[PDB]
Structure formats: C-alpha cells, structure tokens
Design a protein around this ligand. Structure first.
Ligand SMILES: NC(=O)c1ccc[n+]([C@@H]2O[C@H](COP(=O)([O-])OP(=O)(O)OC[C@H]3O[C@@H](n4cnc5c(N)ncnc54)[C@H](O)[C@@H]3O)[C@@H](O)[C@H]2O)c1
Ligand SMILES: Cc1cc2nc3c(=O)[nH]c(=O)nc-3n(C[C@H](O)[C@H](O)[C@H](O)COP(=O)(O)O)c2cc1C
Ligand code: SF4
Ligand code: SF4
Ligand code: SF4
Ligand code: SF4
Ligand code: FES
Ligand code: FES
Lengths: 72, 425, 112, 277
C-alpha cells in the first residue's frame, strides 16, 4: 500500500535525521525492503530530510543498483 | 610459483576473524612502536624515504600526501580507504580486506596519528558483503582490546572508523567522486587544484589513500624503511599485487616486486597460455589501461615505464589474450565498459566515448573507410588530453595502444575486409 | 495566522488566533530579557504552555537570528513594534540595525 | 604578495594570487573560449573549451579552474587547441539535434558563436539521431533538450542563486538529462517560482521564455538601457533590451551582488509585457 511505505520509510529515515550525510544508505535500505524505489518513498525521504526532490531523484537514478520501477 | 609476498603475507596461514591469531604474527606491533616509541614527525619522514608510491594507480609518494595533510589549517582531519574496486577483474583489494582487515586498520590508525586525524572512513561496495562483515566485526574486536577507541594506549589519541557502504559505481572510486558519494551526492568529479588535502570531506582536510598502500605503512614502520627500499628498481620501491587472468594457465592473485619483465609474468609464473597457442597481447591496467605486445617483453613493469608504453597501472589487472583474439573487438569491449561507467559531466567523455564505440563497431563490421581511423585516433587523443577525470583520460587507452602496435591489424579491416579474429563476417 | 508561506522548510508553525495578541507577544518577549508567567502570556497567543515554551527555547539557542515582518502585520502599528521588540529580546543585532527587515510593498516608501 | 603577473598570448597581464587564469584573462581584455563559465557561479569544468597550455608543459589546463601563478606563460591559440576545440564543438553538434534554422536563440547562442568562430562547416561524426523530450507544458518556459550542452548552469542557478532547487541531473552517462522534481514536467513541479533565472543562465536555446520568442534576441536589438525594477522594494538592477519601441528582454545585472541577477516573475515578464498594452 502507498500508505504503508510512508510510515515504513519514516522509520528508516528516523535514525538519520540531522546527521549531515547518509542518503545513499537510506536509499539502499529502502531498496532492500521494497526491491525498488517508488515515487512515494522518494517524496517522503525528501520531505523528512528536507532535501530537494531534484537531489534525491538525481542520486537515485545515478547508480545502477537502484530502480525507479517495480522489478521483475 | 616463486614470488615475494609483503601485503598478503598472511593469506590463509591466519584466522580471518579472531584478532589474537593476527597479533601472534607481529600483528599490531607497528602501532606500538609508532605510538609509544617514535614521534609524530619521524614516522612521517622515515615513510617519506621508504619511497612508498600510491598503489591506487597514480604512483604518488604517500609521504608527500601525508605532509600536505598534516600541514593543514583548522583542527579536523579525515583518513579514507578506497576499496570501491569497480574493475571486473580487480578483486585484488576485496581479497585483502577479507584476508587481514587488521593490517588496514593499523594503516588507517598510523595515518590518523601522523596527520592528526580524529575520524576515519572506509569505502566498500555493498556488492561485497563478506569484506563488509569481516571489517565491521574486526573494528569491534580491535577496539575492545583498546586499539581503536578513545585514548588508545592512553596517549591523547582517538580514532573511530565508520564503514561506509558504497553504492556501486566505478566513477565513485576517484577521490572527488568518493568524497561526493560519502556526502550523499552524485559521484561527479570536481576540478583538482583544490586537492583533497586542503579541502576534502565537509571542507575538512582528508588524506584519501588506497587499501594496499594502507596495508604497507604498518610493515614499513616495523621492518624499517631501508629494507623496503631494497626491493625496487630505482624509483618504484616495493611489491605490487597483480590479478593475472584471461586465457592463462594459472589465474589468480600474485605478488611480484616492481621492475619485473613481463615475460616472467606470463611465460614462467602462470606457465604459458591456456593452450598450445602463442601470446598476442596483455592488458595491464584493467579496462582503462593499455595493452602491451611482443615488443614489450623485457621491459620492466614500473609506474614510469608503463606510461611510456601507453598502458596505465591501475586496478592492476593483467588480462592475457590468445593469438585468435582481435584488437578491434578487445578495444570495443574495454571501451563499452568505460562508456557505461561514465558520469556525463565532461563533453569529451560523454560524447567521444560513444563516438569511438560507434567507429570501432563500424570498423569491425567491415563498413569502415580509411579516414575513420584517423578520426578515431584524433578523437582518442582529444578525449585523453581534454577530459576532466582520469576515467576520460585513460578510457581511450585501449584504442591508442591497439593502433600504435596493431596498426596493420586495423588497416586490414579497411583494405581486405577480413578479420584475424575469425568470429565475425 | 496564514498558510505558512514555505510549506516544507519550516519546522515550527505557530498559528496565532486574532484579537489582541500584540500585548501577549510583547509580555512573552519581556521574560526573555529578564529571566533569560509564560503560561499567562500564552493564552491569547492560542498556544498550550509547551508550544510557547519550546518557541522560546529555540529562540534563545540562536546566536544570530532574524525576523521577517510582513505587510499583514501592518494592520496594527502595534504588531510591528512587537516584532521589533522580539528582535531586541533575542540580541538580533547587525552593524546597520536590528534584524527586522520589513517587507515594503513599493520602492518610494519614504518618498510617498 | 597578492599581486602576480602572467603572460597570456605574449601580452603581460596583472592579477591577484587567488584567481584563476580565466579571471586574469578577462580582467584585462584577453579572450578565451567559454561555454560552461558564468560570472557569479563557482567554476564547473564541463565544456573543456577553455583549455590552455604553457610553454614546456605539454599538458592542457582548464583556464577557468586552474589558479594563476606568477611566471607562467599562457598560450590560448595554436593548431592543437583549435583542433581540439573544433572536435568538442563537433561532438556537441553530432550528439544532440541542433536545428539553427528555427532556434529562438539562432543569433545569440554561445554554442553557435563558438562554432562559427572556429569555422565549423561539418561535424565529422555519424550524427546520432536520438529522441529527446521537448517540454512545453509550462505556458511560460520551454525546455527543448535537443539543444543541451549539459553545462549545468541551470542547475547551479536554481540552487545557489534562487534556492528553489527544481533542477538536477537524471541518469548518468550519455543519458544525462536536466529534470524537474522527480522527473516531472516543469508544470507539475511545485518547487518552481517561475523566475526565469534558468533562461538567463542557459547559453544555448534549451530553456527559453516562450512569449518573446524570436524577438528577444540580444543580437538584433536597437538599444540597451540599464535601470531599476519599480514593482517592489528590493529594486533589482535590470538590462532592458529595446527593439522597435518595445521591451523584448529584461536581464538581471548584478551577478556580483547577493541577488545574483535573478529577477522575479514580475520583473522579467510584466515589464516586457507592459510595453505592448
Ligand atoms: N580501480 C582503480 O584502482 C583504478 C581505475 C582506473 C584508473 N586508476 C588510476 O587512477 C589514476 C587517475 O589519476 P588520479 O585520479 O589518481 O589523479 P592523480 O594522478 O593526479 O593523483 C595524484 C595523487 O597525489 C595527490 N596529490 C597530488 N598533488 C597534491 C597536492 N598538491 N596536495 C595534495 N595531494 C596531492 C592526489 O590527491 C592523488 O592522491 C591513474 O593513474 C590510473 O592508473 C585506478
Ligand atoms: C575512474 C577512477 C576510478 C578509481 N577507482 C579507484 C579505486 O577503486 N580505488 C582506489 O584506491 N583508487 C581509485 N582511483 C584512483 C584515486 O584517484 C585514488 O584515490 C588516488 O590515486 C589516491 O590513492 P593512491 O595515493 O594510493 O594512488 C580511481 C581513479 C579514477 C579516475
Ligand atoms: S541552441 Fe544554438 S547551436 Fe543549438 S540549434 Fe539553437 S542556435 Fe543552433
Ligand atoms: S523558473 Fe526559476 S525556479 Fe523555475 S526552474 Fe527556472 S530558475 Fe528555477
Ligand atoms: S538547459 Fe541550458 S544551462 Fe541547463 S545544462 Fe542544458 S545547456 Fe546548460
Ligand atoms: S525584479 Fe522582482 S524582486 Fe527584483 S525589484 Fe523587481 S519586483 Fe522586486
Ligand atoms: S573483431 Fe576483427 S573480426 Fe570482428
Ligand atoms: S569553460 Fe573552462 S572548463 Fe568549462
């Protein structure tokens, strides 16, 4: 559910608020627990870390390990 | 066969997890004699005469980099260990972090003591879970014994390690891309003159180094410096881990001193090609490295000697080719790798790499003219001399080196339309 | 009492209810010059004691704060003084003046 | 010392020990080709057109990011550099789809001027005919990615000067692209203030103000007058361009002040829309 991922990634970004770094590990752990990075996950990561959406989408699509669509 | 092992002088004659097995073989002694016997200055100057050049690929004297990092402003430093080995064939370094993480921990600690670094990072790809596991447990098993926590030996010296798991890119192995990747940004290299010793992680001075040069500072401290300078030629002193692979009988990691003729590497160490075939070429520096052939058989392998031969030393992978392999296809494969792992920041690389891939594809497919070869050569030279990061400056290496030694093999694709690879129409 | 003009950069949205919140604000900042009471000065501000408490707590921990006073606050020449007093009650000084930076709607303000 | 001296093109130039070579060149009059350099933004190092070499050293150094050091001789024009710069321009033209015939910036584009000054009359490369998106969803701004040099001066203007970090780079490699928030079109992005600082920063004709297309070319103006924006109190300095009794373009002078030349939607949309009432 698109509402489950909201709180579920809230609990993954919790240990990282206000620590000056560690965004690619956040994305790594959202990839581990979802297999892909949905748009809702990225929007909530941006709203919690108060990092712009352009930055999180740029770093999410920079690496080949991540995926923006559900994988087979 | 017969080779000198310094970096991997532990291999399997050690337990990879429990530390007291490691200390039973002079494990942490260096740290003591550098933290309780010597001064934070002589430890730098006696490394500076050891001639330990950067084993990461550049070949820079680590003593000079440590001097640049120590003589910095402000009181906040860092030490970083680059184990984001992205070359598919350069498992050289993951094997070291999986064999003896404690020697690397010692090296990072010695660096922190000399430079004056409080914190420290290690960069490992999330694709290597074994090294990450063993290092995460080794740092704990080494701080419990009071070697990686606060007031080590009670000497006003603290050193914490934060293992950072890499994301997986190959451009993220450069200093600036690594620094950007730790800070949660894109691994896009930045201009060099603000070097990562006056301005690094979060603006604080850093001393990024490779893992095999980190695995050498411990031994050169304890066994001395005059001894380490007695295994080099005249400029490059020490050992070097090589990944001998390809169509060779004996494949794996070897440790030869520097200034070794390549013949011994392929004719008597691996024991010859993996059939009754003959030797055509050997790529020396992984994907972004040149390729040497039979005119280079008695040329010693150094940092300065390989450069004159168009081949760079980096990722240390020595992949050997049979007589059947074609150099046009070899160049295309090694350039299609560096294209996929390009950042897309500098015009020369973002464009010329794709264009050279197309030119090589049309020269191998028989649709090549006689001036597209000149176009390819000039494009290689332009991308080499204009690109920002070393990726763009060493990506058109397997084209320059395949044209300067196999020029007839290229011209044969334009004039007689047939290929000695015997694999394609 | 507005739409929080930066929905995504603010970390403390304090919505004041209308009426006479100007004396409430001026008495609230009076304590920050002396003690640095709050509950009594936080009733017309429509904030439970805790809300005003950590407002003051973040206001005191800032070494160089600044206030942006808008044109809505000019519905009463009292609230402008309230903002300018919150400026002095937190040591928001600069070599050209206080940290108030009013948002004037035209350029010929003094001229007009 | 804080007072160094170099020799660019034989001409002796003065400068300060902290600047780069391009700054010392621009300080006197001296010309160096630039495409990704913008006064007011931290040097990027992407186009590699500002390459320059010293006597003795065969290496090539980017004049915009390499610092100046007293005693160095600088050579900006020779056969090697002309060849390399022409190859870079030909790569840029063969990679993307540049149609100068109907470009809105077809007489004031930095790339086109650099191509004409280097006598480019052929591309020498197989002309990759790739399909790039043209984003005209926003009624005011148009982003035609067929004309992108990937200089990132739009991503640096919406980040350090504006703050509305709406633009960034999508997938790496040759597939690099300038996207809005989360790969959306500009009209779906909520973090945009419609300031047009990106249109002023773009050297090519990728980002373009739509309603003044083909009229707001700085090359075919009649007069340039600098004044102040009357609409609000900030009072931003402007660079009004006049053509046939009409304001066709308002650009923000003040790339040295903290504003950075970014004007508000009013300052650069209402003012040229006012002259046609
Ligand atoms: N996987 C790999 O290991 C791999 C992959 C490709 C290539 N490579 C190697 O990468 C290299 C690319 O060059 P590079 O990126 O190492 O750059 P470089 O050759 O300029 O590196 C020089 C080193 O010296 C340091 N240095 C130099 N001057 C300094 C100063 N004034 N102050 C502080 N530090 C200073 C730099 O920080 C760096 O560590 C090639 O030599 C290549 O063989 C390695
Ligand atoms: C594309 C590219 C990838 C690199 N990858 C690595 C790497 O994985 N590990 C590494 O130690 N150095 C790597 N380097 C070299 C770095 O610049 C290195 O951190 C630097 O040379 C310092 O290490 P050294 O002093 O031991 O040479 C890479 C360089 C480039 C251009
Ligand atoms: S952006 Fe410049 S080079 Fe490209 S089509 Fe338009 S005028 Fe021509
Ligand atoms: S209009 Fe302004 S806010 Fe929007 S993308 Fe352009 S510069 Fe950024
Ligand atoms: S849109 Fe313009 S400014 Fe932005 S990267 Fe492309 S060419 Fe450069
Ligand atoms: S451009 Fe906009 S912000 Fe600047 S003075 Fe004019 S109205 Fe005010
Ligand atoms: S590689 Fe020469 S035959 Fe295709
Ligand atoms: S202009 Fe000097 S590198 Fe881009």
């Amino acid at each position: 559910s698109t509402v489950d991922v909201v709180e579920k990634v809230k609990e993954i970004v919790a240990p990282w608020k206000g620590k000056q770094g560690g965004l690619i590990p956040i994305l790594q752990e959202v990839q581990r627990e979802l297999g892909y990075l949905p748009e809702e996950a990225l929007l909530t990561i941006s709203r919690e870390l108060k990092m712009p959406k352009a930055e999180v989408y740029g770093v999410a699509t920079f690496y080949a390990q991540f995926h923006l669509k559900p994988r087979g | 066969s017969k080779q000198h092992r310094i970096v991997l002088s532990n291999c399997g004659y050690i337990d990879p997890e429990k530390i007291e097995e490691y200390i039973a073989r002079d494990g942490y002694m260096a740290l003591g004699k550098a933290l309780l016997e010597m001064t934070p200055e002589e430890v730098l100057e006696e490394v500076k005469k050891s001639g330990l050049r950067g084993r990461g690929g550049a070949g820079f004297p680590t003593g000079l980099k440590w001097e640049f990092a120590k003589k910095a402003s402000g009181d906040k430093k860092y030490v970083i260990c680059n184990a984001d080995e992205g070359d598919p064939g350069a498992f050289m370094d993951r094997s070291t972090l999986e064999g003896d993480p404690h020697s690397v921990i010692e090296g990072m600690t010695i660096g922190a003591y000399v430079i004056g670094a409080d914190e420290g990072y290690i960069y490992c790809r999330a694709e290597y879970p074994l090294a990450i596991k063993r290092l995460k447990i080794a740092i704990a098993q080494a701080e419990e014994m009071g070697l990686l926590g606060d007031h080590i030996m009670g000497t006003n010296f603290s050193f914490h390690l934060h293992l950072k798991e890499g994301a997986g890119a190959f451009v993220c192995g450069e200093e600036t891309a690594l620094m950007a990747s730790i800070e949660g940004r894109r691994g896009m290299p930045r201009p060099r003159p603000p070097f990562p010793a006056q301005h690094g992680l979060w603006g604080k001075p850093t001393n990024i180094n490779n893992v095999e040069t980190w695995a050498n500072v411990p031994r050169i401290i304890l066994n001395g410096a005059d001894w380490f300078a007695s295994m080099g030629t005249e400029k490059s002193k020490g050992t070097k881990i090589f990944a001998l692979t390809g169509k060779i009988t004996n494949t794996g990691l070897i440790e030869v001193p520097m200034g070794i003729t390549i013949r011994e590497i392929i004719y008597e160490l691996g024991g010859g090609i993996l059939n009754g075939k003959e030797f055509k070429a050997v790529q020396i520096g992984g994907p972004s490295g040149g390729c040497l052939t039979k005119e280079h058989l008695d040329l010693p392998i150094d940092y300065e000697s390989l450069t004159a031969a168009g081949a760079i030393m980096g990722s240390g992978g020595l992949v050997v080719m049979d007589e059947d392999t074609c150099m046009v296809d070899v160049a295309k494969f090694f350039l299609e790798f560096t294209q996929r792992e390009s950042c897309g920041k500098c015009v020369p690389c973002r464009e010329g790499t794709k264009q050279m891939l197309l030119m090589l594809q049309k020269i191998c497919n028989g649709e090549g003219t006689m001036d597209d070869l000149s176009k390819l050569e000039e494009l290689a030279h332009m991308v080499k001399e204009t690109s920002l990061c070393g990726l763009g400056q060493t990506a058109p290496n397997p084209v320059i080196t395949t044209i300067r030694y196999f020029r007839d093999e290229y011209v044969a694709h334009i004039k007689d339309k047939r290929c000695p690879a015997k694999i394609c129409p | 009492y507005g739409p929080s003009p930066f929905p995504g950069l603010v970390d403390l949205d304090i919505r004041l209810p209308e009426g006479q919140a100007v004396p409430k604000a001026l008495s609230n900042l009076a304590e920050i010059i002396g003690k640095i009471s709050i509950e009594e000065s936080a009733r017309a501000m429509g904030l439970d004691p805790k809300i005003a408490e950590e407002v003051a707590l973040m206001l005191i921990s800032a070494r160089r704060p600044i206030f942006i006073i808008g044109g809505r606050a000019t519905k009463s020449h009292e609230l402008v003084t309230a903002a300018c007093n919150l400026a002095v009650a937190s040591k928001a000084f600069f070599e050209d003046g206080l940290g108030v930076v009013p948002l004037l709607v035209s350029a010929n303000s003094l001229g007009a | 010392m804080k007072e160094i001296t170099l020799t660019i093109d034989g001409k002796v130039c003065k400068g300060v020990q902290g600047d780069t070579i391009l700054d010392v060149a621009n300080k006197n009059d001296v010309y160096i080709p630039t495409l990704c350099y913008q006064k007011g933004l931290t040097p990027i190092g992407a186009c590699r057109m500002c390459v320059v070499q010293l006597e003795g050293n065969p290496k090539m150094l980017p004049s915009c990011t390499t610092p100046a050091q007293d005693g160095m001789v600088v050579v900006t024009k020779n056969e090697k550099l002309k060849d390399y710069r022409r190859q870079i321009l030909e790569l840029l033209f063969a990679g993307r789809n540049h149609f100068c015939m109907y470009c809105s910036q077809s007489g004031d584009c930095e790339l086109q001027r650099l191509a004409i000054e280097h006598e480019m009359d052929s591309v020498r490369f197989p002309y990759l005919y790739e399909d790039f998106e043209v984003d005209a969803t926003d009624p005011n701004l148009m982003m035609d990615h067929n004309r992108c040099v990937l200089c990132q001066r739009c991503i640096r203007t919406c980040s350090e000067i504006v703050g509305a970090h709406t633009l960034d780079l999508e997938r790496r490699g040759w597939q690099a692209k300038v996207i809005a928030d989360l790969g959306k079109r500009l009209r779906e992005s909520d973090t945009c203030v419609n300031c047009g600082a990106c249109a002023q920063s773009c050297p090519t004709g990728t980002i373009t103000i739509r309603e003044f297309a083909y009229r707001g070319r700085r090359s075919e103006c009649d007069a340039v007058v600098e004044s102040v924006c009357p609409l609000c109190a900030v009072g931003c300095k402007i660079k009004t361009y006049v053509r046939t009794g009409s304001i066709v373009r308002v650009e923000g002078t003040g790339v040295e002040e903290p504003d950075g030349g970014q004007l508000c939607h009013m300052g650069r949309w209402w003012l040229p829309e006012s002259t046609e009432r």
